[PDB]
Amino acid sequence: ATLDSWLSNEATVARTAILNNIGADGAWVSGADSGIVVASPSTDNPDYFYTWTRDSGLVIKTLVDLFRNGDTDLLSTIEHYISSQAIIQGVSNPSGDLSSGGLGEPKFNVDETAYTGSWGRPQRDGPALRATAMIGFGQWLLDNGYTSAATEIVWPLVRNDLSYVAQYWNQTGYDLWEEVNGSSFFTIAVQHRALVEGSAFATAVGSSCSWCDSQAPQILCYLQSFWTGSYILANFDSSRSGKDTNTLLGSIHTFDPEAGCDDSTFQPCSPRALANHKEVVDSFRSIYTLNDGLSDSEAVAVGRYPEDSYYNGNPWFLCTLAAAEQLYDALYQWDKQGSLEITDVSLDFFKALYSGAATGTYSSSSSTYSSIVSAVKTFADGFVSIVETHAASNGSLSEQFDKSDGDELSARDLTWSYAALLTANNRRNSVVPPSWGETSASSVPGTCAATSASGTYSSVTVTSWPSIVAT
């Protein structure tokens, strides 16, 4: 269709735009140091000309997956990023120093100096996301015989971030949207993931991560509290409803292609994640004029949370794409398992798309399976069409699009918007990320304990990168 062709061309635009936003050769961000991912080239109204640990980590993880799939030209970009982080980790900032909380700092100036003004800090999801991005490259390094780079450069940087996660996971902080000071689903979910793959990586380089091991099961134990019985609570200590795309992001970014539809880890096809998906998406159906007239079986423009007032509260490209990505992941999981199950928890999600839905197990060769996956694929593609409809003619994706007229607003050419497009497109094409070991990390302890474990901190100096040839 035109969606297919638009996506193929947009994926090329997205890759280029991301590179334009990374220093020190990025065309849109002169001033940014080497390997510094800038959130947006917008220097004013709003000023997003800074580097966020979260956006950077999410973007780099996307680039690492493309690289491992054959986009070898991204190698230098990844190396520069890792080199820049060795410096950033040691930058004394309002959150602290390397070993005293500095790693939880949300953003920095593009020249690698600390941002000293007031900001919602700390944001504990950053160290987890940065660790996950680096671990993926470290795995490639190990697999391709560059053991030294993995052991001496990557591992020590990762060890710092994992120590921060294990030490402070059970403390409040700001959510990914930088507004709620409390405890957040997305954050807890990505932290659990980071400790699990961090322990596997530590073992691989001949070291260990005892703190990853003791804390991961406890974080997972706590993660269960976010399920309300009908949807996933985005944050504790909040007065909002709790329906928030924060939860869809938590699911797609902790998706493991080897995982079943596990409720404990909220995988994309888990009854809990599907039930949550309908609750979150439905919360935007009546608040945006842009959604007027659409029925419940049709995709709609999705924002962050229904109570949002940032720029008056509008749909976001990355949030609308996350709604589609969770479904592409679920389709992949159902296909790989050879069946789909409908339970009392997920019945409403399915019934909205296929009125004949009934609880039961449906094999991939059954008529019901076929009807359901077709309906789900159409629904998912629907979200992507809404994005296509509001992107600029040359493919530019801003942070938000107007709730009434769909015009682009807020930060222009948002790097995260482009990475979200690349991942949704990949999943749509059944291109999945490497597994993180969910299959041996979904067991919940019988009793949850408020605890922590302190790891270790040590400053890393990147003397030089070996002549790595990636073919």
Ligand X SMILES: *[C@@H]1O[C@H](CO)[C@@H](O[C@@H]2O[C@H](CO)[C@@H](O[C@@H]3O[C@H](CO)[C@@H](O)[C@H](O[C@H]4O[C@H](CO)[C@@H](O)[C@H](O)[C@@H]4O[C@H]4O[C@H](CO)[C@@H](O)[C@H](O)[C@@H]4O)[C@@H]3O)[C@H](O)[C@H]2NC(C)=O)[C@H](O)[C@H]1NC(C)=O
Ligand Y SMILES: C[C@H]1O[C@H](O[C@H]2[C@H](O)[C@@H](O)[C@@H](O[C@H]3[C@H](O)[C@@H](O)[C@@H](O)O[C@@H]3CO)O[C@@H]2CO)[C@H](O)[C@@H](O)[C@@H]1N[C@H]1C=C(CO)[C@@H](O)[C@H](O)[C@H]1O
Ligand Z SMILES: *[C@@H]1O[C@H](CO)[C@@H](O[C@@H]2O[C@H](CO)[C@@H](O[C@@H]3O[C@H](CO[C@H]4O[C@H](CO[C@H]5O[C@H](CO)[C@@H](O)[C@H](O)[C@@H]5O)[C@@H](O)[C@H](O[C@H]5O[C@H](CO)[C@@H](O)[C@H](O)[C@@H]5O)[C@@H]4O)[C@@H](O)[C@H](O[C@H]4O[C@H](CO)[C@@H](O)[C@H](O)[C@@H]4O[C@H]4O[C@H](CO)[C@@H](O)[C@H](O)[C@@H]4O[C@H]4O[C@H](CO)[C@@H](O)[C@H](O)[C@@H]4O)[C@@H]3O)[C@H](O)[C@H]2NC(C)=O)[C@H](O)[C@H]1NC(C)=O
Can you give the binding site for ligand Z, defined by CB under 6 A?
A: 13, 17, 28-31, 41-45, 49, 392, 394-396, 398, 408-413
Q: Is 79 a catalytic residue?
A: no
CB of 48 to ligand MAN, least distance (A): 25
Is residue 105 within 8 Å of 114, Cβ to Cβ?
A: yes
119 is in an annotated binding site: yes
Classify strands 339-342 and 235-236 as parallel, antiparallel or unpaired: unpaired
253 makes contact with ligand Y (CB under 6 A):
no
Q: State how far the Cα of 40 lies from the Cα of 47, in Å rounded to an integer.
A: 8
* Partner whose binding site includes residue 446, from ligand MAN, ligand Z, ligand Y, none (CB under 5 to 8 Å by kind): ligand MAN
Q: What is the maximal distance between C-alpha atoms in the chain?
A: 63
Q: Closer to ligand Z at the Cβ: 283 or 320? A: 320
Q: Is 312 helix (H, G, I), strand (E, B) or coil?
A: helix
Q: Closer to ligand MAN at the Cβ: 106 or 156? A: 156
452 makes contact with ligand MAN (CB under 6 A):
yes
Q: What separation in angstroms does the CA of 385 have from each of 48, 186, 300?
A: 27, 26, 10
453 makes contact with ligand X (CB under 6 A):
no
Residue with tokens 């007239």: 293
Where helices occur in 305-366 by DSSP H, the ranges are: 317-337, 347-353
Q: What separation in angstroms does the CA of 287 have from each of 301, 302, 315?
A: 10, 10, 10
Only one of the segments 220-228, 247-255, 363-371, 429-437 lies at the binding site for ligand X (rule: CB under 6 A); that segment is 220-228
Q: Is 175 a catalytic residue?
A: yes
Q: Find the binder of ligand MAN among 31, 46, 90, 313 (CB under 6 A).
A: 90
115 makes contact with ligand Y (CB under 6 A):
no
Is residue 376 within 8 Å of 392, Cβ to Cβ?
A: no
Q: Closer to ligand MAN at the Cβ: 355 or 463? A: 463
Q: State how far the Cα of 116 lies from the Cα of 108, in Å rounded to an integer.
A: 9
Q: State how far the Cα of 125 lies from the Cα of 346, in Å rounded to an integer.
A: 28
Only one of the segments 52-60, 230-238, 319-327, 400-408 lies at the binding site for ligand Y (rule: CB under 6 A); that segment is 52-60
Structure token pair of residue 62 = 């996307």
* Listed residue (333, 341, 322) closest to 280, CA to CA: 322
* Partner whose binding site includes residue 26, from ligand MAN, ligand Y, ligand Z, none (CB under 5 to 8 Å by kind): none
Which residues sit opposite 316 in a β-bridge?
400
* Partner whose binding site includes residue 4, from ligand MAN, ligand Z, ligand X, none (CB under 5 to 8 Å by kind): none
How many chain residues are in contact with ligand MAN, going by CB under 6 A? 29
Q: Closer to ligand MAN at the Cβ: 23 or 217? A: 217
**Could you give the residue numbers annotated as active site?**
175, 178
Binding interface with ligand MAN (CB under 6 A): 86-87, 89-90, 98-99, 156, 167, 217, 262, 438-443, 445-446, 449, 451-452, 454, 456-461, 463
* Residues placed in the known binding site for substrate: 119
